[PDB]
Copies of this chain bind each other. A is one copy, B any other.
Amino acid sequence: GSDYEFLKSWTVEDLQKRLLALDPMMEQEIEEIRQKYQSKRQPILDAIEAK
């Protein structure tokens, strides 16, 4: 529970720091999932390729 509607009153420097930080926020989460599920998908490809 936290709201960001008050960003309208924050300095350009404080809000900019959230915008740039928003990039590695979604990136880390996505890359990790892409890798983790790739780990789970890998043996599946390896299996069908061996039948």
Contacts and interface: CB of A to CB of B under 8 A. Distances in A.
Interface of A: 4-5, 7-8, 10, 12, 15-16, 18-19, 22, 25-26, 29-30, 33-34, 37, 40-41, 43-48, 50-51
Contacts of A44: 4, 7, 15, 18-19, 22
Contact of A45 (B19, B33, B37, B46): B19
15 contacts: A4-B40, A4-B43, A7-B46, A8-B43, A16-B48, A18-B44, A19-B44, A19-B48, A22-B41, A22-B44, A26-B33, A26-B34, A29-B33, A29-B37, A30-B34
Contacts of A26: 33-34, 37
